[PDB]
Design a binder for these strands. Structure first.
Lengths: 83, 106, 434, 162, 80, 95, 73, 82
RNA sequence: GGAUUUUUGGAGCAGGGAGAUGGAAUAGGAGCUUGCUCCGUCCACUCCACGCAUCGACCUGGUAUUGCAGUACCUCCAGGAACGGUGC
C-alpha cells in the first residue's frame, strides 16, 4: 500500500521543502514532482553541496535513495494522516 | 488537643524528677491557683499521664540514656532479631493460651 | 528543647515501634520467594531505623552530663513550671484533632494491602535488586562470567560444566594463570559472588562477617592455613614453598617477596584477597551454586517447549417448556432478523418484537439519559445517536416556542412613555432609578 | 500556592518564537523555585512570567537549555550556583525585578557562554558605571541591555574598579 | 524457511543485539516481526565509543543489526 | 508448500550454501567473516536462503589497535546472526 | 513498479551528481523504471579541473545523487 | 500488531544512519516504517579534533521533516505527548 | 516480497614529519622499588605546506537603509580566525 510518509511528501509537493541527501547535500527548494520511489524533482532549489557553499539551481532532481532527511511544510501539521 | 498533649507530657516530665508519691512538683501545683485537670483519678487521662510518666521513668533508668550507652540494640541486628523472634513467640504463646481459655469458656 | 526528656521519649517510641515491626515481619509468613527476600530487606530497613535511633540516642550524654545536676533539684520546680505554662498559654484556637504523634510510627513501620510495604518501605523492593537469571534468589547470573572467561582465554572448547567445576573447587590446581589477567576476571567474579552472597541475606551481620573474613585473611590465610607433611608451607600469592616455619618467616619479610616482583606482597594483595573471598563465597554457597548448575543443566537438557515454558515463568432460543423452539417458529416470529441500536452500545436485538420493546427497556432509557435526552415517545424508532441529538434540537426549539417566557416577552410601561422587557424594567427599577 | 509538577506536566513546552523548546509558566505566581528537571532534556527556554519568585535560585542540573525568562518577578538576591546547573545557556531575561546592588551581579561571571541578558526596569540600572561592572565581570557577554557590547565599554570596564 | 521466523519466537527474552551502528543494545525486547524489527524495552544502549546509556522504549529495525545474542538457557531447536 | 520447501532444501543441500549444509548435517564449525572484520568461530545451528545464521559455541574476535593491534576476543556460545553482515562463510577453518 | 517522471527532462542537458564525487553533463535520452539514465554527449568532469567527454553512457541510479537541468525545459 | 503505534503521537529521538539524532513528535509509519516528524530538531555532534577542546552538540531546526526509511536505526521516546 | 530510491547494509579502518620541547598527583614493561636509561597511545607551543581553497553564521568599528509581512540566508569595506562541512 501507500505510506502515510509518502502521502505527507505528496502533500509537501508544490511548496518549499528542504531535503538532505546522503553526501550532506541540503536542497531547500520548491518540491515540484515526487513519486512513490521518493524521487523528488524540485525547482528553484538551494543546494548546499554539504560545503556551506550553498548555490541556487533550478529544476534539480534528487532520487529517494540518498534521502537522509526531508523537511516538509510544517503547515501540514494538520494533515489528514496524523489527526 | 495538642496543648493538652503538651501539658500531659510536661506533667509526666516534671513528675519524673520528684522524690516520692507525695514529693513532686504536682502536689502543690494542684492548689497553686493553676488548672491541673488531669491529676484526678476519675479522669481517664490520668492513665495517659501515668503512661507518659512510665515512658519518662523508663528513659530515666540507667539504661534509658543517662550515663550509659545502648550498643546491642544500636549496632546489633542479631540482638534485634533475637528480640523480635522472642516477641513473636511470646505473642504466639499468648494466643495459644487465649485459645485454651476460650475453649474453656465455651 | 528537653534534650533528655523529649528526645529520649521520641527515640524510645521509635525504637520500640521498630522492634515491634521486626517482630511482626518475622511473625508473618512468606508465600513468594521474592516475598521472603523483600521481607528480609524490609526487616533490614527497620533494624537500620532502630539502629539509627540507637546511634542518635547514644550521643545524648553531653547535655545530659550537664543536666544530671539540675534535673534532680528538689527545691526548684513550680517557677519554671508556671513559666512553661505561660509559654504554652498561647492561642489554643486551633480547634482541630490530630492523633499524629505515635499512631504515625505504626503506619511508617507497618505493612500494606496491595503489597507489604512500610512508610520508608514504599519504594524498596527486589525489582532493582534481584536478577531474572536468578529470580531474586532462585538461580545464578553467571552467563556473563562464562562469556568473560571465554573471551579472556580465547578457547572454543570451554563448556559451562567444565567452567563450573573449575570455579567450584576450593583451592584446586588452577585452569588459568594467577600472574595473568585471568586473575583480573577472577576479581570481577569475586565481586559478583560477594554481591550475590550479600544480596541473598540482608539480615545477617554484614560488618561482622566482613570483619571475620578480614581477620581470617590477616591471621590465618597469610600464615600457612593449608599445611603439608617446601611442602610444609606454601605461599598463596607468590607461589613458592617454605621448608619450615622459620624459612617462611624469612621468605615473607625478604627483598624479592615484598616488591621484587609483580607477584609480590605489595602488588598481588588485592588479587589474593579477591581470590580468597571468591573461594569463601563458593564454599558458603556451594549448595547454591550447585542448585544454579542444576537449573542450567535442566535448561540445557530439557526439550525446547519446556525450555520456552521455563523461561516464560442448537442454533435456536429457549422457551417456558425448557427446550428449543421449532425452526419454522424461529423464522415465523422473525427471530432470524437482527436489529442494532447505537444508543444501546451497538447491542443486537433478535426479531421485531424485542426490537419494538427495547425503546421502553432500561438499556435504551439509560443510553438516552447518558446523551442528556429524556426517553419520551418522540424518540420511538430512533436508533442512531446523531438522529437523537438532532431531533432533540428541533424538539427543544419547538417547546421553546410553545412555552411562553413571561419576563423575556412581557411589555412594561416606561414612566416617560416607553416599552421594555419586564425583566429589564424590574432590574433597572431597583437599578438606582427605575 | 505551592510550586509542583502539576503546573509542569500541564505547562506547555513547545517550539517558541526563536525555534527553541520553551516551557511557559505564564500565570503561575509560583514562589518556590524547584523541580524543573522533570522536563527530561527536551527544553531550551524556561519562561516563568508572573511568578512570586523573590529570588533567582533553585535550578536543577539541566544540560542543553539556552534561555531563562524570569520576567515580572520579585528578584531580591542572586544565587551563586547557576552555571554548573545550566552550562549551555546563553540568554537570561531577568528584567523588571528588585535588583539594586553591584553584589546582585556577583554570580554573573560564572557563565562562560552567557551572551544575552536583560536586567531592565530594575533599580540596579541608575547606578553609575553599572553596565561597566556588567561587561567587566562578564567578559563573554556581547548583547547587553538591547545594545551590543563594545570596545569603549570594555576599556571603561577594565579601567574603573581597579 | 528463514530464521526471522525463529527470531519471531521471542518476547520478554533477555537478549543482547549488536546493531550496525557500532552499538551493543541489551534488553527484554517487546515484539519482533518478519522484517527483523526488534523493539526493545529497559534498553541498555552503548554506541561505538559511547556510554551504556538508558532508553525506556526503543524500536530497532532489522537491517541495522549486525549480530544478535539470545539468553543462555534457551532452546534453539524448538525456538527454530 | 511441500514441494516448494523441498526445492528450498535442494537449493541449500546442492547449491553454494554447501557450507551451511555441512554445518547443519555433521554439526561443523564455520568461520564467518562479518562485514566489519569480525571473525566468528562456531558451529551453525540453522541456516536459510538469505544465510540467516543461528550459531552455537561462538567466539567473536577482532584486531583492536589501542600503536600495535591486539587481538580482542569474546566467547558468545549461542548467537543468532542474520545473513546481512556475512562477507563469506567458510566451512572448514584450520583452527 | 512505476516508471519515473523524467520525460520533460528528456532531450535536455543536465548537470548531474553521481556518487564518488563524480559530476557529468549529459543529454537525458531514455531509461527504464530502474532509473538507468541514457546520457548522450556525456562529459564527465572529475574532481580535478580536467574533463573527459565519454559521449554515450548508461548510468546507474545507484550512484547518481541528483541532477540539475541546464535548460528550462 | 503494528507496535510503534503504541509509541505514536509522542516526542521521540529518531536515529539517522550517520550517527546523529532527531528529536520530534512521531506522526505515523508505513511498511518500511519511514518517518514523518512534527516539531523536529536535529542534534549533530561537532568534532573537537583535540583533547583540549570539548565535544559539543549543535541543534538544527527542521519541524515537519520527512525522514526517509534510509535513516531509521533506533528511536527513543524523550518527551511526553504535547 | 535479500540485484539501481527506503529493512538482510560499501562497510570498516587510520590522522602529514621532527627538534638536547613539557605533564601522566592515582595506572606502563625491562634493566629485579626511590634515582637514571629506552620503547609501542594524547594534547599545549615553535618549524615545515598556521594542512590548503571555498562559502555559511560569527566579532570589532566605520558605512547605507525608516522601509507594512510572513522567511533557506540578506547593506558595503576590512581583519581575525572562537565554529560547520565539501575535493586533494
Amino acid at each position: 500500500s501507500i505510506g502515510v510518509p509518502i502521502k505527507v511528501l505528496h502533500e509537501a509537493e508544490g511548496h518549499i521543502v528542504t531535503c538532505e541527501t546522503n553526501t550532506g547535500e541540503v536542497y531547500r527548494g520548491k518540491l515540484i514532482e515526487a513519486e512513490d520511489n521518493m524521487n523528488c524533482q524540485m525547482s528553484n532549489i538551494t543546494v548546499t553541496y554539504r560545503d556551506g557553499r550553498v548555490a541556487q539551481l533550478e529544476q534539480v532532481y534528487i532520487r529517494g535513495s540518498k534521502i537522509r532527511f526531508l523537511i516538509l511544510p510544517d503547515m501540514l501539521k494538520n494533515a489528514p494522516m496524523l489527526k | 488537643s495538642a496543648f493538652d498533649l503538651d501539658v500531659v507530657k510536661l506533667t509526666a516530665q516534671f513528675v519524673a524528677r520528684n522524690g516520692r508519691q507525695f514529693l513532686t512538683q504536682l502536689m502543690q501545683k494542684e492548689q497553686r491557683n493553676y488548672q491541673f485537670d488531669f491529676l484526678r483519678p476519675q479522669h481517664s487521662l490520668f492513665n495517659y499521664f501515668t503512661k507518659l510518666v512510665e515512658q519518662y521513668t523508663k528513659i530515666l533508668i540507667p539504661p534509658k540514656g543517662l550515663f550509659s550507652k545502648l550498643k546491642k540494640e544500636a549496632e546489633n541486628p542479631r540482638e534485634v532479631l533475637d528480640q523480635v523472634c522472642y516477641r513473636v513467640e511470646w505473642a504466639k504463646f499468648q494466643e495459644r493460651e487465649r485459645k485454651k481459655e476460650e475453649e474453656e469458656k465455651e | 528543647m528537653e534534650t533528655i526528656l523529649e528526645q529520649q521519649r521520641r527515640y524510645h517510641e521509635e525504637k520500640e515501634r521498630l522492634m515491634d515491626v521486626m517482630a511482626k515481619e518475622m511473625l508473618t509468613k512468606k508465600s513468594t520467594l521474592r516475598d521472603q527476600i523483600n521481607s528480609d530487606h524490609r526487616t533490614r530497613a527497620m533494624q537500620d531505623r532502630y539502629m539509627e535511633v540507637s546511634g542518635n540516642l547514644r550521643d545524648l550524654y553531653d547535655d545530659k552530663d550537664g543536666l544530671r545536676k539540675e534535673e534532680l533539684n528538689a527545691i526548684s520546680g513550680p517557677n519554671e513550671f508556671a513559666e512553661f505554662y505561660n509559654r504554652l498559654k498561647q492561642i489554643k484556637e486551633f480547634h482541630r484533632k490530630h492523633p499524629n504523634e505515635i499512631c504515625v510510627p505504626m503506619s511508617v513501620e507497618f505493612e500494606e494491602l496491595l503489597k507489604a510495604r512500610e512508610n520508608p518501605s514504599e519504594e524498596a523492593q527486589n525489582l532493582v535488586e534481584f536478577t531474572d537469571e536468578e529470580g531474586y534468589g532462585r538461580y545464578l547470573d553467571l552467563h556473563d562470567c562464562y562469556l568473560k572467561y571465554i573471551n579472556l582465554k580465547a578457547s572454543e572448547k570451554l563448556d559451562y560444566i567444565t567452567y563450573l567445576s573449575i570455579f567450584d573447587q576450593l583451592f584446586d590446581i588452577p585452569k588459568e594463570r594467577k600472574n595473568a589477567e585471568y586473575k583480573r576476571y577472577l576479581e570481577m567474579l569475586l565481586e559478583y559472588l560477594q554481591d550475590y552472597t550479600d544480596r541473598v541475606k540482608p539480615l545477617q551481620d554484614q560488618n561482622e562477617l566482613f570483619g571475620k573474613i578480614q581477620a581470617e585473611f590477616e591471621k590465618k590465610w597469610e600464615n600457612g592455613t593449608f599445611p603439608g607433611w617446601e611442602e610444609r608451607a606454601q605461599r598463596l600469592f607468590s607461589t613458592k614453598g617454605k621448608s619450615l616455619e622459620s624459612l617462611d618467616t624469612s621468605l615473607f619479610a625478604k627483598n624479592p617477596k615484598s616488591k621484587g616482583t609483580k607477584r609480590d606482597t605489595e602488588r598481588n594483595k588485592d588479587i589474593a584477597f579477591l581470590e580468597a573471598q571468591i573461594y569463601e563465597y563458593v564454599e558458603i554457597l556451594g549448595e547454591q551454586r550447585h542448585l544454579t548448575h542444576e537449573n542450567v543443566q535442566r535448561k540445557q537438557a530439557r526439550t525446547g517447549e519446556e525450555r520456552e515454558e521455563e523461561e516464560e515463568e442448537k442454533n435456536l432460543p429457549l422457551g417456558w417448556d425448557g427446550k428449543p423452539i421449532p425452526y419454522w417458529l424461529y423464522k415465523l416470529h422473525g427471530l432470524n432478523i437482527n436489529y442494532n441500536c447505537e444508543i444501546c452500545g451497538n447491542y443486537t436485538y433478535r426479531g421485531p418484537k424485542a426490537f419494538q420493546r427495547h425503546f421502553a427497556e432500561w438499556r435504551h432509557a439509560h443510553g438516552m439519559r447518558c446523551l442528556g435526552i429524556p426517553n419520551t415517545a418522540h424518540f420511538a424508532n430512533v436508533t442512531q445517536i446523531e438522529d437523537a441529538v438532532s431531533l432533540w434540537a428541533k424538539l427543544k426549539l419547538q417547546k421553546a416556542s410553545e412555552r411562553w417566557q413571561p419576563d423575556t416577552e412581557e411589555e412594561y410601561e416606561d414612566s416617560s412613555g416607553n416599552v421594555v422587557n419586564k425583566k429589564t424594567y424590574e432590574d433597572l427599577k431597583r437599578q438606582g432609578l427605575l | 500556592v505551592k510550586l509542583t509538577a502539576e503546573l509542569i506536566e500541564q505547562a506547555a513546552q513547545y517550539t517558541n518564537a526563536v525555534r527553541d523548546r520553551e516551557l511557559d509558566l505564564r500565570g503561575y505566581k509560583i514562589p518556590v523555585i524547584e523541580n524543573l528537571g522533570a522536563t527530561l532534556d527536551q527544553f531550551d527556554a524556561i519562561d516563568f512570567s508572573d511568578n512570586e519568585i523573590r529570588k533567582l535560585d533553585g535550578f536543577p542540573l539541566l544540560r542543553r537549555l539556552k534561555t531563562l525568562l524570569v520576567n515580572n518577578n520579585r528578584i531580591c538576591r542572586i544565587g551563586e550556583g547557576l552555571d554548573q546547573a545550566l552550562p549551555c545557556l546563553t540568554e537570561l531575561i531577568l528584567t523588571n525585578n528588585s535588583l539594586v546592588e553591584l553584589g546582585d551581579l556577583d554570580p554573573l561571571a560564572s557563565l562562560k557562554s552567557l551572551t544575552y541578558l536583560s536586567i531592565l526596569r530594575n533599580p540596579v540600572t541608575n547606578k553609575k558605571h553599572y553596565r561597566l561592572y556588567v561587561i567587566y565581570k562578564v567578559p563573554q557577554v556581547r548583547v547587553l541591555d538591547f545594545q551590543k557590547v563594545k570596545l569603549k565599554e570594555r576599556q571603561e570596564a577594565e579601567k574603573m574598579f581597579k | 524457511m528463514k530464521l526471522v521466523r525463529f527470531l519471531m519466537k521471542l518476547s520478554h527474552e533477555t537478549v543482547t543485539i549488536e546493531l550496525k551502528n557500532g552499538t551493543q543494545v541489551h534488553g527484554t525486547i517487546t515484539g519482533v516481526d518478519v522484517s527483523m524489527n526488534t523493539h526493545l524495552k529497559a534498553v541498555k544502549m552503548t554506541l561505538k565509543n559511547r556510554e551504556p546509556v538508558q532508553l525506556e522504549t526503543l524500536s530497532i529495525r532489522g537491517n541495522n543489526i549486525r549480530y544478535f545474542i539470545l539468553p543462555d538457557s534457551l532452546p534453539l531447536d524448538t525456538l527454530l | 508448500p511441500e514441494e516448494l520447501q523441498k526445492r528450498e532444501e535442494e537449493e541449500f543441500n546442492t547449491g553454494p550454501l554447501s557450507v551451511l549444509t555441512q554445518s547443519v548435517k555433521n554439526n561443523t564449525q564455520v568461520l564467518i567473516n562479518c562485514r566489519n572484520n569480525k571473525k566468528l568461530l562456531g558451529r551453525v545451528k540453522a541456516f536459510d536462503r538469505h544465510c540467516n545464521m543461528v550459531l552455537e559455541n561462538v567466539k567473536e574476535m577482532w584486531t583492536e589497535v589501542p600503536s600495535k593491534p591486539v587481538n580482542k576476543d569474546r566467547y558468545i556460545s549461542k548467537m543468532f546472526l542474520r545473513g546481512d553482515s556475512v562477507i563469506v562463510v567458510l566451512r572448514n577453518p584450520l583452527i | 513498479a512505476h516508471p519515473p517522471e523524467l520525460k520533460k527532462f528528456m532531450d535536455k542537458k543536465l548537470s548531474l551528481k553521481l556518487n564518488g564525487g563524480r559530476h557529468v553533463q549529459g543529454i537525458l535520452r531514455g531509461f527504464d523504471p530502474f532509473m538507468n539514465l541514457v546520457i548522450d554527449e556525456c562529459v564527465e568532469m572529475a574532481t580535478s579541473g580536467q574533463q573527459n567527454n565519454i559521449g554515450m553512457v548508461v548510468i546507474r541510479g545507484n550512484s547518481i545523487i541528483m541532477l540539475e537541468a541546464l535548460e528550462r525545459v | 500488531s503494528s507496535k510503534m503505534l503504541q509509541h505514536i503521537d509522542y516526542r521521540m529521538r529518531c536515529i539517522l544512519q550517520d550517527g546523529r539524532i532527531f528529536i520530534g513528535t512521531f506522526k505515523a509509519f508505513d511498511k518500511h516504517m519511514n518517518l514523518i516528524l512534527c516539531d523536529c530538531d536535529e542534534f549533530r555532534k561537532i568534532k573537537p579534533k583535540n583533547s583540549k577542546q570539548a565535544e559539543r552538540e549543535e541543534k538544527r531546526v527542521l519541524g515537519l521533516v520527512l525522514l526517509r526509511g534510509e535513516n531509521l536505526v533506533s528511536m527513543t521516546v524523550e518527551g511526553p505527548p504535547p
